[PDB]
Amino acid sequence: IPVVYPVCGGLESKEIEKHKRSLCLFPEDFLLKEFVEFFRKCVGEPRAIQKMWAKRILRKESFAATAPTGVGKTSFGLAMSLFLALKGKRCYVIFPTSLLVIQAAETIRKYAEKAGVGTENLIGYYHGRIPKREKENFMQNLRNFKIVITTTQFLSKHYRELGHFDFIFVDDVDAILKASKNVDKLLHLLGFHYDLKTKSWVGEARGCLMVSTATAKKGKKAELFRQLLNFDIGSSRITVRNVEDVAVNDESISTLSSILEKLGTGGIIYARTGEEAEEIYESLKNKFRIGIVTATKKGDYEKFVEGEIDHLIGTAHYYGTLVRGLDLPERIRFAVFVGCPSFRVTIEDIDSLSPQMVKLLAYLYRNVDEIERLLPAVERHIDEVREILKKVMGKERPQAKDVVVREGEVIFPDLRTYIQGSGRTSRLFAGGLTKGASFLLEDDSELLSAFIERAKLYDIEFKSIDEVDFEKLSRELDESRDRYRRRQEFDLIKPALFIVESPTKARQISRFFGKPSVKVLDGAVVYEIPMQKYVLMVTASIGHVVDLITNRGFHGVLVNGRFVPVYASIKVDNSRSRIEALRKLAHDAEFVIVGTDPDTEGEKIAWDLKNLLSGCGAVKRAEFHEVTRRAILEALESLRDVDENLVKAQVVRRIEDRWIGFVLSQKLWERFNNRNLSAGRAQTLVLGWIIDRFQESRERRKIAIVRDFDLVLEHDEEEFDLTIKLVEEREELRTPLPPYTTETMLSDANRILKFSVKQTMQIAQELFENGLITYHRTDSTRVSDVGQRIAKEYLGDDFVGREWGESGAHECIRPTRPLTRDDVQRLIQEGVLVVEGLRWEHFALYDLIFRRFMASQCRPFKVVVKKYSIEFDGKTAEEERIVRAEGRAYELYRAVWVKNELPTGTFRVKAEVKSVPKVLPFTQSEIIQMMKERGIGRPSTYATIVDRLFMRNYVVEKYGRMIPTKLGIDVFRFLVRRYAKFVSEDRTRDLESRMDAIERGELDYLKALEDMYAEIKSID
């Protein structure tokens, strides 16, 4: 029952073309607007994110409030508390310090001092102060208070006897997670009574709870909030930053560290060891105001905070010891690292130490047969490795660039610390993200470099070289922080439901900014995290929310001088729920960003979404051809609107498969009644070629095989006398092959690795989804500037240009970072590149992609081609062969066949001879190429077409080659003999283009559908 803007038209069924109440209205919407106005009277204009919370609460939804500082969280809670009390709902606000409780009480009265009541029968607070009389007055009346504020302590002590609350607000969540019972005691207050008997609970949410993100340990106790309130807490670290990173190969206490101290003050220095730290204090004290910390004594911290001190010296270890691990958003302005934060592992150390710490070192090499522990019972045992280690390593020099070997000893750069250390230098506020600066000075050249390189892995980790504008810097910092102070006046950071296809993608992306807080809505999981651009709430559509219906109109299309696609919910869950789920989130954000795949189907999803979530909020489209923090941000800076052109091509293509597919398949059920049969045009065609290869394979059983020479001649004599007459022998050097494209990838994936095309696509997808390669569906070989810069960083000297193809807007399939298969595997073990469900096969694949690509950009290679002319039994054949090829490109991608060479000589031969087929049956690899050469099928379809044939039992494979079956044959011959004109290679090849055409905005879909509708009813 939907009007304005069941059955929405341009949500029972979406009846859409393309190019009196409201649609995105929720119940609590009238309860909200009141609240806003209310807020406008006690604090001001509700911030986007503050409005989103309200909704959550007005719908009684518990969750972990995660957002930038400076945003009015505390005010909200208080305010919202007061609002619910005016509705006689009662609320509980829990704080972690006496004063906060007091500040809180004031903040309410103040509000109330704006058309509010204020009566005693309203607010009641309690903390460690208060005397004989007011303590009594509290307990004896507690329960008639619509608002109860107290420290997080009073809770543990008096959970029982505290009434229940409709809304309970927790300021600091670590003030609770400290003691397990706190949790229990909270749910209790909400109506969740434990059941010793069942040893589990049971209960109905009486109210709703709202808590901050946590800074300290997690604990399996929090897990309780999941099964009970469908929500995980998650960190308030938020790994984003501005920060200017400067690298100096000099750590001179003099002409350097002190010249940097020219950069105003409030710098925090970090020294390798406590011992090394103090060694500076004296070196530097009669220049600049100092400070030193640690176990010994602090005080310098207060002196710093208060302004006495201008800087601080300490360790990555001790600074944490301080309050909040040392967090002064306004004071701290920059940090200098005296010595690259590193980790050490000695040659004579190997012995004792975590096995999962032996694996890492296990890599870094591999030269010999050490891969033989790679695959492992894991515990094939480290012991065997530790020993293997000792023996080899001194002389052997690894190839890595992120660490140093020297000579017996391996130095590990420690970025974790670095990030964390220079992170105090930049914070996320309602006003953006303070500017930072981190000066890392190290004398150990080789090491510094290793850091520098290792940094790259943590993206946004490039370093300058004192080629800094110091004058500006000092300003930006003092300026920037000035902003923060004025944080109370911004709201640049707003919510934005970011919809991606799969959960994998969801996770990968939300993690790009930290440990997001979760929430499980009626029909969907949402990972919400804050960042410089918005307060993302990445959620996964789980594919297409809707698909072509099967009843309405002609096979889904309303016709009669019309053509109007009809869409329906999908599919034991119904996708209608995800939509209903999505419209709610959308509702709360008032702004949606679809980030589905960068293809037509992807565009088709945003499209529907654009439609379905109408009214709710703007629905922009983020386009990126790789799933990586960097790409995503770039996208977040280049949003566009659904590209209608893609949709139309998305539609039409669909409609065909529906029409030409159904009707034909049907004709296959009418004859020799056997449903479960299937016709597809594209597949009938192929299936055809698949036959017109088999019928040709049962012939010309000629051929003879020499014993020494890799010779194969079409003859029929056992022994004989051959003649090798060396003719030509040129030395050619040329360009490698282009970077893979869906087509050729599926091929090499079949020829080299023995993967089926359905498998490879699956792998590719997962590889793509784990930010390791560009998008896998692509027919372009184009190489983005960035992509060249990737190769250059690996090849070096061997790196050539080669843009490869300069059409379309699509790019080839290739590595996202310069990282061989090992490097990846390593980093994964090392924990630098986190990913989901990847087995050998993936890297088996990732490997070829990397090679193919890096080859494409690599230098031309030298190949030696020696021709040969042979004459025997009156017959003389002349063939040419490759006897040798050398160069980088070949070491990476063995494109050419280096057959065996053969000195000239007319001597006595000994052949085995055999009865070989005229030709041999196609292999997924060859058949995939024909599909391209010939013009049939596309990246989104090559694999599917070929699969079908196998699953409809039309084809089977033998010796790794494709072979038809009667079932199939009789099938092929059926469609061919009687409807050959709908299956004509030409019709399919031309039609296959009308689509690309419509997609590029050249052919008209309407005028495209007529020819299709007509053509089809032409049999009905």
Ligand SMILES: Nc1ncnc2c1ncn2[C@@H]1O[C@H](COP(=O)(O)OP(=O)(O)NP(=O)(O)O)[C@@H](O)[C@@H]1O
């Ligand atoms: N939406 C708003 N519009 C204008 N001013 C606001 C708004 N929300 C909060 N404030 C103000 O901001 C100040 C901080 O509010 P408070 O409840 O302490 O929020 P907080 O941001 O959670 N604190 P912190 O993150 O520690 O700065 C108070 O003066 C006001 O409530």
Ligand SMILES: [Mg+2]
């Ligand atoms: Mg606070």
